Amino acid sequence: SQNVYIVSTARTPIGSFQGSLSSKTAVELGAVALKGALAKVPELDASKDFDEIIFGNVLSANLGQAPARQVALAAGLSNHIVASTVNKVCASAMKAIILGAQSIKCGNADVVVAGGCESMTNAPYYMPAARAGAKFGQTVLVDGVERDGLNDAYDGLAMGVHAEKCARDWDITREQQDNFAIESYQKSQKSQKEGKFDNEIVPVTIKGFRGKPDTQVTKDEEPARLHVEKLRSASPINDGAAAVILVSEKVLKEKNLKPLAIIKGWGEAAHQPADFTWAPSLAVPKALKHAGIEDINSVDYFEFNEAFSVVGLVNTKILKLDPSKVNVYGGAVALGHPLGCSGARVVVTLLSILQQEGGKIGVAAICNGGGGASSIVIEKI
Amino acid sequence: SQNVYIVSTARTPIGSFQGSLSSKTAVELGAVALKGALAKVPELDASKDFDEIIFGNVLSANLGQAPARQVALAAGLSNHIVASTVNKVCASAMKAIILGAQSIKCGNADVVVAGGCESMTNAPYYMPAARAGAKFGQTVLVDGVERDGLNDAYDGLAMGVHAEKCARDWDITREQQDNFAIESYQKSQKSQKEGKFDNEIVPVTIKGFRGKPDTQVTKDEEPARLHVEKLRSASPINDGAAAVILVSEKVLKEKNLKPLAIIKGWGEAAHQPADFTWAPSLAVPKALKHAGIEDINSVDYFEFNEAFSVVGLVNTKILKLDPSKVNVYGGAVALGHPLGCSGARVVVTLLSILQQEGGKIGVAAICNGGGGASSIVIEKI
Amino acid sequence: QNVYIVSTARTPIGSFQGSLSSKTAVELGAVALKGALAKVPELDASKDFDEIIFGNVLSANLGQAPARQVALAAGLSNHIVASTVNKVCASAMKAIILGAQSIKCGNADVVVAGGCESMTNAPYYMPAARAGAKFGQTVLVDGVERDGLNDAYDGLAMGVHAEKCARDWDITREQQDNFAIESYQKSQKSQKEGKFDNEIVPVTIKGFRGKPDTQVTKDEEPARLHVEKLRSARTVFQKENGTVTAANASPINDGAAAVILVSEKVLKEKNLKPLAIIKGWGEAAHQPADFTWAPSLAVPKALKHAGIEDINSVDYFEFNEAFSVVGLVNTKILKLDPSKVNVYGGAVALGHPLGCSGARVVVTLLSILQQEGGKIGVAAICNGGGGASSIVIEKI
Amino acid sequence: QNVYIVSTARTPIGSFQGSLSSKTAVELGAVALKGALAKVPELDASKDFDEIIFGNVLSANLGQAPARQVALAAGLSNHIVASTVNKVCASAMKAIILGAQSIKCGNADVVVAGGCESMTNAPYYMPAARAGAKFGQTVLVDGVERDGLNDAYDGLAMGVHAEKCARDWDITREQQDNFAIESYQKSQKSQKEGKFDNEIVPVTIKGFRGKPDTQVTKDEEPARLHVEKLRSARTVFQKENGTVTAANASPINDGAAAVILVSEKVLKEKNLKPLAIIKGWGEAAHQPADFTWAPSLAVPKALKHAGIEDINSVDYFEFNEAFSVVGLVNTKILKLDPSKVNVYGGAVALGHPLGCSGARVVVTLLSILQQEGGKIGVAAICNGGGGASSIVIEKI
Structure with missing residues (x-):
């Protein structure tokens, strides 16, 4: 019923499995990406202007209560924001954008944060038998990446x-x-x-390990690790986050924002x-x-x-x-x-x-x- | 932009922690509730009429890929359905209804299944140290109910x-x-x-354990377990599921459905x-x-x-x-x-x-x- | 050089996850040992006991030196020489044999031998925990099976x-x-x-939350006999043409036993009546x-x-x-x-x-x-x- | 009755998660034992060895009867009488003492004694796994600490x-x-x-995926000395006014050792040269x-x-x-x-x-x-x- 504009986007570099972003949680990566996006639109005030966050996440185990909520609050957004986490497996973060756009079209929000985050590295193992007990005989520890992420149900x-x-x-x-x-x-x-990725990427600070100096992860890790002979002679497991800021036409006019694109x-x-x-x-x-x-x-x-x-x-x-x-x-x-x-x-x-x-x-x-x-x-x- | 009607509702009984629904997964409970709701509106054909499912769930660990998708397919809905799982902690299933209503108002769906499911009993324990290793010294096994459900982040x-x-x-x-x-x-x-709950509740079949007869859980378990002196002299942990069917006015007319309520x-x-x-x-x-x-x-x-x-x-x-x-x-x-x-x-x-x-x-x-x-x-x- | 059994005692044998589930192997060991010590007051706990050799198979999560803990929990002097021995099912018999040999050589004059086990409270192991599982499912091993019941x-x-x-x-x-x-x-x-009344010393079970303490006084398994069910019980180890079942095999159990061994010298000096000779x-x-x-x-x-x-x-x-x-x-x-x-x-x-x-x-x-x-x-x-x-x- | 040491051998001592991390305690035991057996060919593996008494502290996940497995993996006859002994750090010394006593009594004429340990491959335990954790967090216990390093x-x-x-x-x-x-x-x-060349027998490490096999031939820890870092190392056990550190304490390690004991009788019949007398x-x-x-x-x-x-x-x-x-x-x-x-x-x-x-x-x-x-x-x-x-x- 009304136009939805993308006014800002950002993403972290994509880390390899057990790789450069291993020390970061999914929520922390989410906050980095979102703070990267907020910085480009200072006309939108963090303390008042953001009505809603819809954020993608698949492996929510051990992230704590309400990952999307945490992402918003860690990024410095007002605790008045309406937060929800959405899971559509691989499509989660796209579904978040669509749900954000629908929310704007219905007049229920004027500014929406959408995007998603994931740390497949720090997805935990599960013990299904732990609560009630194993009683006798061996029991299985399930890899959360496989069970909830990579394997068909x-x-x-x-x-x-x-x-x-x-x-x-x-x-x-x-x-x-x-x-x-x-x-x-x-x-x-x-x-x-x-x-080509320089404009979209915001780096991730890595804390130096007990006397080692802090550093920054600035680029996608996977592309340089091509091994042709190995490939010729399956699951890509990765960590990262991305965020996009959506606004109504009204807001775009009142705040004097530059639209990047229209949905x-x-x-x-x-x-x-x-x-x-x-x-x-x-x-x-x-x-x-x-x-x-x-x-x-x-x-x-x-x-x-x-x-x-x-x-x-x-x-x-x-x-x-x-x-x-x-x-x-x-x-x-x-x-x-x-x-x-x-x-x-x-x-x-x-x-x-x-x-x-x-x-x-x-x-x-x-x-x-x-x-x-x-x-x-x-x-x- | 257009009216949204509730045409059917159903829910399971609510089980106590480690209680009457312990043998059922969150997805299985979801399917029961949804099948209960579908049965009341046979004018809507499972194989063609349902465009989307948005389903609430908080503790998704060990449920398998895409809980909402599984619920839909287990309930006999067509695999053409657009499925997504939403988490807003306690408000998850309400948020699902709101997102379903928005979807209908935008003209992107005509029939939406909304609701939610949870088995806090069968939420697993996590081992955060399992993947990378504990190396030396004790490590903690986290209760998923506490970490992702009951405790503030x-x-x-x-x-x-x-x-x-x-x-x-x-x-x-x-x-x-x-x-x-x-x-x-x-x-x-x-x-x-x-x-008073008889019209909304659909029972859950419990498989009899190796020669024990199958049975049905028909009523909410928690109310009969009041202990006044104990209360006077905190977390209510439970299992259950609920489903509601939303339709546009158009569909309500073409299929000749009785509306129960309007959102x-x-x-x-x-x-x-x-x-x-x-x-x-x-x-x-x-x-x-x-x-x-x-x-x-x-x-x-x-x-x-x-x-x-x-x-x-x-x-x-x-x-x-x-x-x-x-x-x-x-x-x-x-x-x-x-x-x-x-x-x-x-x-x-x-x-x-x-x-x-x-x-x-x-x-x-x-x-x-x-x-x-x-x-x-x-x-x- | 003669070795005399001067006192014996044992706990009741508890069923798997049964009447002794609240007690550790060490705690059961202490009960049996104290039961045996009580019958020979002439031997002073603080001075007369040279060595303890105690059988135990599933030592995981018992803490440092199970036999040592058993001795100290039973009120024996911390001057006692303690060792734990494992010969699987024969562990406790091996402990008696090693105690006899020790007396025979003149290294010790009074030896506590015996054994203890809590198969109930044997833990599960995670072999992959230290170095990490990395990717894919990993197994939690039942210690009872891996170290007790299965062939290596x-x-x-x-x-x-x-x-x-x-x-x-x-x-x-x-x-x-x-x-x-x-x-x-x-x-x-x-x-x-x-017939077991002289042997058995009871185990006190702590009543939790204000209920009174209870007493385990007899072996738990014998009362479970149902002859008809026994004869039509399923073959558990071999599906087809099997003979062994749960009912004609030994179950999984908790318990402890202790025997006190002395030299001929000590027998005369302390004026003890010997029950038997090895x-x-x-x-x-x-x-x-x-x-x-x-x-x-x-x-x-x-x-x-x-x-x-x-x-x-x-x-x-x-x-x-x-x-x-x-x-x-x-x-x-x-x-x-x-x-x-x-x-x-x-x-x-x-x-x-x-x-x-x-x-x-x-x-x-x-x-x-x-x-x-x-x-x-x-x-x-x-x-x-x-x-x-x-x-x-x-x-x- | 005299007891003679006739042969000795040991593995190199590996660091925690170090050069012997791929080997189990039993495998290290077998290497040391085979190293010792090789030096006395007059003693036939299939007939002359009466008993094995072998030290081991962390027995969790080693399988049934570690000492038995060590004997059989080293090619000894399955007629050998095998037992595992635990006296924490003194386990392997206790094994020698018990072997000597056994020879002295005439029960055995040839005894293998020694010990083995892989502190690297000691598992984590889950005490709550069998009966269930029910609600709230539970702990995974490090077996090295619980049964090895911490006081009970x-x-x-x-x-x-x-x-x-x-x-x-x-x-x-x-x-x-x-x-x-x-x-x-x-x-x-x-x-x-x-000086350790006679003692030490090397451990072969399997090369994984087509790389050649490698050899661990020496003790891993001695090369790590850095004197300045040693003197300014943090006090690990006591924060304030501490004296003990990681560098002036023993580390956590993997290894095995074996000694062969014989009676005076066997020494003469098989024409063995004795190295020492107990x-x-x-x-x-x-x-x-x-x-x-x-x-x-x-x-x-x-x-x-x-x-x-x-x-x-x-x-x-x-x-x-x-x-x-x-x-x-x-x-x-x-x-x-x-x-x-x-x-x-x-x-x-x-x-x-x-x-x-x-x-x-x-x-x-x-x-x-x-x-x-x-x-x-x-x-x-x-x-x-x-x-x-x-x-x-x-x-x-």
């Missing part, structure tokens, strides 16, 4: 296993997937070298849990229809999360897209996939692409475990 | 401790709180005896984390304003979750409410408080009160850990 | 090897069940007639899987060591009944009169607290010699790993 | 009691540091000159907190038992240096020539694998007598709980 198989099934189903070879993975790494490394529309779809990898081919058309884009060729750039090579290959094929418009800075296969964050990360990167590569209309898409996908259409100002 | 104190602080702050004595608790138990027991409005507010108990006094006025209710005396019944006695006492006082209109079937202090469920449970019970006690306008409210509260106004048909 | 070489339970033994010596389910029933019935009769002992081992009939090798060695050249001169036999097959095989191999063997019942009916049973059988044997008019007695116990220990005693 | 009565670390000892006998931080430095420097010199031994104990100077009580008893009436007739002393204070106090109390004590260094510099150290000091002592031209030697080791063990050997 219905067959127990890892997302990478389902990505392989999808490749077989669409007659995409192992070699094709490897080629694409390698190509994606090289695009990610090149985009890094050329400073034209969004679409969500789902089908068989095992077929999640090509669920974006269902969500994208719904989003384009919602945005009033009749022709798919009017879109300038596409960013899929593309955590697996098959996701990039299949969805481009099904949608009949020009591959030169798709994931021009690389994808999650190379950059990493912090589950609760990635959904907003693709939107952050998409917006950077539109600004830096001279695009006007962009669509972001992300598939999620459970069989779903989410998609958003934005137009640069 | 900022000071680490249980919700009951903050309820006591609130009582001191508003000069409400220990004896007053005990009186109210006891009174609430007796109202809950009486409402149970008179069959007139809602309001959310927050302040200091330690003061969560009287956050409903901020949320209720916002909800009434959103619903266009100028006078608070036009409301016929109030249902607060009222997990602690102080919540009932303080908020009634601050809002200057007629105590005979407030929590006439009792409250969570007596019935129990399954965190991710209670937010929808109060709406379910409120609607039952309006139908059975001859009310037209009702407001439900629920405070949550982190300092927030959510509120909804409904009008019976 | 193939990882199979003692019951699986009891089944192998049943097959190799063609002992049927029927035979085992009848032996089990017999063991229960004898155990119940002995309890009824007070005539000899024998230990043997072979294949781990064949532990069930290792006592048939150990017994002959003990008799030879004692100077008994005809096996029929011994009046009573106490074989630890870890399984019904153990009682049946060793009686058959040694070609013994079954009426001389385990006359008060055995571990199938009374329970099997691993670290304790080795001394428990000696404690009971001595009572049998005193009460049933026997002079010569042999105790024998098999142990996981393929071994067995045996001791010959003569009543004075 | 007050729960304080051995280092806290070492501080008490420093205060009670007025031994300064400076004195301890200088003793520590001295121990490191001697240890390094001995390593340089190959002249005697002595054990004593007192207050748990005073364990550090318990060796000063044990040593006199051993000398009396051996028939040595003047302490100056002994050529070399091996005291286990659990802490720098232990070396200093016991030398002062016994009024010994410090140049006769721990001439190759000690546990502060070499490491202290609890279940192994008791035999390790005997192994090293014997090497000292052979290489430094000594005849009479005494080894002594204190243990948690307030005890100490001591043994007197004479080179042949």
Whole structure:
């Protein structure tokens, strides 16, 4: 019923599993990203202007009460903010943006923080038998990353296993997937070298360990660790956070803010849990229809999360897209996939692409475990 | 921008900690409640008519990928449904209803399942040191119920401790709180005896243990376990689930459904984390304003979750409410408080009160850990 | 140089998660030891006890030096030389043998021997905790299984090897069940007639929150016999064509036992009446899987060591009944009169607290010699790993 | 009846989470034992070994009967009588004493004694796992602390009691540091000159994923000495006015040691050359907190038992240096020539694998007598709980 504008975005670097962000919690990473975003829009006062935060997170175990609430308060936002945490597995942070946009369109909020955070490193092990007792015989300690993040709830198989099934189903070879993975790494490394992520990234302070000096994590860790022979001769596990600030048109005028983009529309779809990898081919058309884009060729750039090579290959094929418009800075296969964050990360990167590569209309898409996908259409100002 | 109707509601009985629902997971309880609700509206086809599920859950550890998704699929809903899980601590299930209503008002869905589920019994223990190793010296196994459910994230104190602080702050004595608790138990027991919960409750099948016969859990477990002397001479830990079905006016006409109530409005507010108990006094006025209710005396019944006695006492006082209109079937202090469920449970019970006690306008409210509260106004048909 | 048993005592044997679940292995050890000390006041706790050697298998979470703790908790002088020994099921018998050897060499004049075990309060282990699990599921190991009940070489339970033994010596389910029933019935009769009353010292259980203290005074397992359910019980170790079940095998149990040994010198100086003389002992081992009939090798060695050249001169036999097959095989191999063997019942009916049973059988044997008019007695116990220990005693 | 040491061997001592982290306690035991067996081929593994008594403190997750596993993994006959003994730090010395007693009584003619320990691979325990935690946080206990390093009565670390000892006998931080430095420097010199080469048998470490196998050939701790950092190291057990630190205390370590004992009879029949004679031994104990100077009580008893009436007739002393204070106090109390004590260094510099150290000091002592031209030697080791063990050997 009314226009929703992105006025600021930021994200942390993406850390490797047990890597450079191991000492940070998911909430701490969330606060860093959000503080990075708030700094760019000082016209919005932290103590009064922010009505709501909706934040993505998948592995909430041991984060404490209300992760989104903690993120807001740690970032210096007023405790009057309405906070909620949302989980749509991989799509969590995208769903947060969509829910934020809906909230603005309904007139129930004027300024919304959306985004997400995840520390897959610091997701704990669970002991299901601890409370009632094991009684006799061995019992299992469950890895929370696997159980709640990476494995399908219905067959127990890892997302990478389902990505392989999808490749077989669409007659995409192992070699094709490897080629694409390698190509994606090289695009990610090149985009890094050329400073393409510099505007979106805010660094993370790492406390020096008992006399060691403090330092900063400034860049995505995963791209430099490509090993071609190993790849040819599955789960990307990562840590990170991303944040975006959404405002109504009204607020944009009263506070004299520069809009970065307008949320034209969004679409969500789902089908068989095992077929999640090509669920974006269902969500994208719904989003384009919602945005009033009749022709798919009017879109300038596409960013899929593309955590697996098959996701990039299949969805481009099904949608009949020009591959030169798709994931021009690389994808999650190379950059990493912090589950609760990635959904907003693709939107952050998409917006950077539109600004830096001279695009006007962009669509972001992300598939999620459970069989779903989410998609958003934005137009640069 | 358009009317949202409740067409069906249901809930499980509320189990005691390590009690009658110990053998059920949060997802299984969710499916029971949702199947209970679907059965009442056969005009809506499970295979085609449901666009979205938004489901509350706080303790997601060891539930598997995407609890809301699992609930939908276990209840027999089509895998085309758009699923997301939301956490607003105690208010989770209320927030789900609000997000569902917003989704309908925006024209992005026509039929939404909202509600929530929780098994505090089967929330696991965590081992934070398991992944990287403990190295040397003792390490702690964390109770997930405490860490993510009951304890405040900022000071680490249980919700009951903050309820006591609130009582001191508003000069409400220990004896007053005990009186109210006891009174609430007796109202809950009486409402149970008179069959007041019979229409909303659907039973839970319990599998008989190796030759023992299967049975059904049909009633709320907590009310019968009142011990007055013990009370006079803190955390209510419970298991359960609740579901509500929301539709647009359009759908209500095309499918020839009987509306039970209309969602007139809602309001959310927050302040200091330690003061969560009287956050409903901020949320209720916002909800009434959103619903266009100028006078608070036009409301016929109030249902607060009222997990602690102080919540009932303080908020009634601050809002200057007629105590005979407030929590006439009792409250969570007596019935129990399954965190991710209670937010929808109060709406379910409120609607039952309006139908059975001859009310037209009702407001439900629920405070949550982190300092927030959510509120909804409904009008019976 | 003669070694005399001067006093014995044991706790009641508690069931798994049963009547002694609130007590640690050390606490049970102290009860048994104090029970034994009380019967010989001539020996002063603060001066006369040179050494303690105490059996225990599951030492995890007991704290530093279980035997030492048992001695000090029982009020013995901190000058006592303390050591803990583990020979699995035969631990406590090995403790007596090592105590005898110590007296024999003149190193000690008064030795406390025995054993204790709380299989209930044995903890779970996390092998991956120290270095980290990194990724993927990891296991919490049950200490009872890993260090007590499972073979170290193939990882199979003692019951699986009891089944192998049943097959190799063609002992049927029927035979085992009848032996089990017999063991229960004898155990119940002995309890009824007070045959364990001299042996047993009660365990005080603390009443929590203001309820009065309660007393555990008898063995918990014998009362559970249900003959019909026993005969139709499922085969637990082998699904198809099995013979061993939960009811014809020894259960998991808690308890302790203690015996006081003295030299001939001390016997005369303190004017103590000796209950028995340690005539000899024998230990043997072979294949781990064949532990069930290792006592048939150990017994002959003990008799030879004692100077008994005809096996029929011994009046009573106490074989630890870890399984019904153990009682049946060793009686058959040694070609013994079954009426001389385990006359008060055995571990199938009374329970099997691993670290304790080795001394428990000696404690009971001595009572049998005193009460049933026997002079010569042999105790024998098999142990996981393929071994067995045996001791010959003569009543004075 | 004479008891002769006929062969000795030990593994290198690995650091905590260090060079032997991939090996279990049993595996290290087998290496040491096989090292010892190799030096006496006249003794056949399949027939001549009657008994094994092996020291081990942290038995959790080792599997049934650690000593038995060590024997069988080393290729000994499954007819061997096996038992595991625990006397905390003195376990392995107690194993030798019990082996000697066994030979002396004629029960055995050839005994394997020694000990093994992997403090690295000792697991964490979960006491609440079996019955359930119910509600609220629960603790995962470090087995190293609970059963190895902490006193059972007050729960304080051995280092806290070492501080008490420093205060009670007025031994300064400076004195301890200088003793520590001295121990490191001697240890390094001995390593340089190959003084441990006869003793030590190397441990093969499996190379994972196609990398070649590697070899651990020397003790890991001695190379870590940094004198300046040692002198300014923080006091770990006592914050204010502390004396004991990480660098002047023994570390946490992995390793194993083995000695082969025979009767005079076997010595002549198999035509073995004896390395030493067990002249005697002595054990004593007192207050748990005073364990550090318990060796000063044990040593006199051993000398009396051996028939040595003047302490100056002994050529070399091996005291286990659990802490720098232990070396200093016991030398002062016994009024010994410090140049006769721990001439190759000690546990502060070499490491202290609890279940192994008791035999390790005997192994090293014997090497000292052979290489430094000594005849009479005494080894002594204190243990948690307030005890100490001591043994007197004479080179042949």
